[PDB]
């Protein structure tokens, strides 16, 4: 069976850098491979179709390219709004051909490193109320995306009681937000007194923390 | 102009069945194929089904094969695929697309709009809303939409008034099985006395529309 | 590559005479030209032919998706009156409505002696 290798498997590169996307296909497929961009959770968009035909409502600095086995997406000039996965696909148009997708490759828009800001919110009276405690940290608008969110009470380091979850890069600036969700049981959450999000970053000179007192 | 519209998605039992639909305008879908590709959370593009309607030709991925059926109806100008004995395995955004050619090669040039199915026994369960209450000059606050299933939940601000500095944060699957997100926004500390803030939580799969207003 | 030579090549594509698909050639060739982009225009309208669209399918889309024509207000093409506008026209005659362009598919504004305009709308 073909197999599509797609490499790298995901890049950073600045506004205005000219990006190389690599797919190599495992045998021979002459020049029947094309080329998707697919934003997250979005339908996929068809950008180069036999190898090196630009498709309708695709911009010019999208382009294809074969060598032997070896087929290349460029990107001549990268564009903030181009973040996204990149396809590679083989198939011919011959009944009972199969169809191979490459892996894909995530393309992140690299720029200036720029902090988080940090806020820190306690769990509501209402959340309380109804019997379970969250504790919410906020890292706003940030780049590079890596963050080591460390939660403390009373000056315990917590393990494996916490989630993340990242916004998409920013379509205009290409920065980042990031919120860290500690969840205790209401009996664990009222047996102590400090809370505390420790924020380390690139952007940090020292780390950041952010707390309350329950009371 | 051409298009391909999805239906049928939602929440399944598991060994359930489920049938989407591909409904195509603007072309004749006996000549084409049509594909049926699904995306499962954290993964790649997978290719599932395909059927050339002219001549009936049926293609299968190994994963799918004896359980998902492609079929077409050329009266209603819709391809149709039948997923049987579903598994937590199956649970993806599934995409149907149109295979069309120039010399031979095969692109997928026109794409469904995507339909989540969720092969799940959890209930269906709104969410509870809960303030991020503001703590120089810029105050920071939220709301933790906490304690739903299945996806998706939308957040306004403000019935859509306030959108600068707003961050709605993807979804994070709890470790219980159910979903959380929050919603925050910067804004002037000055306005906290003056102005109100309003989220908008809509959970139109268990038809639950919440207001919270966040105070300091 | 003129305005006038690319009206000419979009011409050979269209059905008939005093179109609407004719009109929209002609305001269409002329913005391309004037923005440089006359080639590009081609090339576009080219590929929409290689997916199977017909020319009137590819002069719609390019009127609605290529970046010359995005926000530009339609030319004014001044009649007697709103009985010499093409009669395979005068179907698709409307109301200029406030901000027309040519991306929403207002073609034209036809302007007549007595002062008064009709939009082509597709
Ligand atoms: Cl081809």
């Known amino acids: 069976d073909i197999q599509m290798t797609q490499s790298p498997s995901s890049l950073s590169a600045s506004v205005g850098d000219r990006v190389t996307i690599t797919c190599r296909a495992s045998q021979s497929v002459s020049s029947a491979v094309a080329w998707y961009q697919q934003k997250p959770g979005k339908a996929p968009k068809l950008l180069i179709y036999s190898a090196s035909s630009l498709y309708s409502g695709v911009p010019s600095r999208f382009s294809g390219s074969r060598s032997g086995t070896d087929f290349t997406l460029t990107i001549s000039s990268l564009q903030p709004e181009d973040f996204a996965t990149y396809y590679c696909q083989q198939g011919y148009y011959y009944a009972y051909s199969l169809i191979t997708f490459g892996q894909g490759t995530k393309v992140e828009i690299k720029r200036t490193v720029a902090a988080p800001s940090v806020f820190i919110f306690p769990p509501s009276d209402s959340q309380l109320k109804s019997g379970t405690a969250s504790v919410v940290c906020l890292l706003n608008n940030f780049y590079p995306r890596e963050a080591k969110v460390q939660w403390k009470v009373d000056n315990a380091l917590q393990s494996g009681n916490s989630q993340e979850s990242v916004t998409e890069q920013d379509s205009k600036d290409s920065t980042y937000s990031l919120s860290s969700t500690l969840t205790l049981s209401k009996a664990d959450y009222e047996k102590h007194k400090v809370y505390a999000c420790e924020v380390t970053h690139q952007g940090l000179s020292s780390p950041v923390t952010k707390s309350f007192n329950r009371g | 102009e051409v298009q391909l519209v999805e239906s049928g998605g939602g929440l399944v039992q598991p060994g359930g069945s489920l049938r989407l639909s591909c409904a195509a305008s603007?072309?004749?879908?006996?000549?084409?194929?049509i594909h049926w590709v699904r995306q499962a959370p954290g993964k790649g593009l997978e290719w599932v089904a395909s059927?050339?309607?002219?001549?009936?030709?049926?293609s299968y991925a190994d994963s799918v094969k004896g359980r998902f059926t492609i079929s077409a109806d050329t009266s209603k100008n819709t391809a149709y695929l039948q997923m049987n004995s579903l598994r937590a395995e199956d649970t993806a955004v599934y995409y149907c697309?149109?295979?069309?050619?120039?010399?031979?090669?095969?692109?997928?040039?026109?794409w469904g709009q995507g339909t989540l199915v969720t092969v799940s026994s959890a209930s269906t369960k709104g969410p509870s809303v809960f303030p991020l209450a503001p703590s120089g000059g810029t105050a920071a606050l939220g709301c933790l939409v906490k304690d739903y299933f299945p996806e998706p939940v939308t957040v306004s601000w403000n019935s859509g008034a306030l959108t600068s500095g707003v961050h709605t944060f993807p979804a994070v699957l709890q470790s219980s099985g159910l979903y959380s997100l929050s919603s925050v926004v910067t804004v002037p500390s000055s306005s906290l006395g003056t102005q109100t803030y309003i989220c908008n939580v809509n959970h139109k799969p268990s038809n639950t529309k919440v207001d919270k207003k966040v105070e300091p | 590559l003129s305005a006038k030579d690319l009206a000419l090549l979009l011409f050979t594509h269209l059905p008939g005479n005093n179109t609407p698909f004719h009109i929209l050639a002609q305001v269409l060739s002329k913005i391309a030209y004037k923005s440089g982009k006359s080639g590009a225009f081609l090339d576009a309208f080219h590929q929409i032919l290689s997916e199977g669209e017909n020319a009137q399918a590819a002069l719609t889309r390019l009127s609605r998706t290529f970046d010359a024509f995005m926000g530009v207000v339609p030319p004014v093409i001044r009649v007697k009156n709103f009985q010499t506008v093409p009669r395979p026209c005068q179907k698709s005659l409307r109301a200029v409505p406030p901000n027309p362009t040519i991306d929403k598919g207002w073609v034209c504004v036809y302007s007549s002696e007595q002062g008064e305009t009709r939009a082509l709308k597709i």
């Open positions: 697309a149109r295979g069309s050619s120039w010399y031979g090669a095969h692109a997928f040039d026109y």
């Open positions: 603007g072309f004749n879908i006996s000549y084409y194929y």
């Open positions: 059927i050339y309607p002219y001549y009936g030709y049926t």
